[PDB]
Amino acid sequence: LAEALHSAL
């Protein structure tokens, strides 16, 4: 999830 969030942003 950490990286999912980073990509989204």
Q: Resolution, rounded to a tenth of an Å?
A: 1.1
Alpha carbons 3 and 9: distance in angstroms, whole number: 10
DSSP 1-9: -HHHHHHH-
Measured between its terminal Cα atoms, the distance across the chain in Å is: 12
Phi then psi for residue 5, to 5 deg, are -65, -45
Amino acid identity, position 1: L
Way the structure was solved: X-ray
How many CA atoms within 13 Å lie on the side-chain side of 4? 1
How many CA atoms within 13 Å lie on the side-chain side of 8? 5
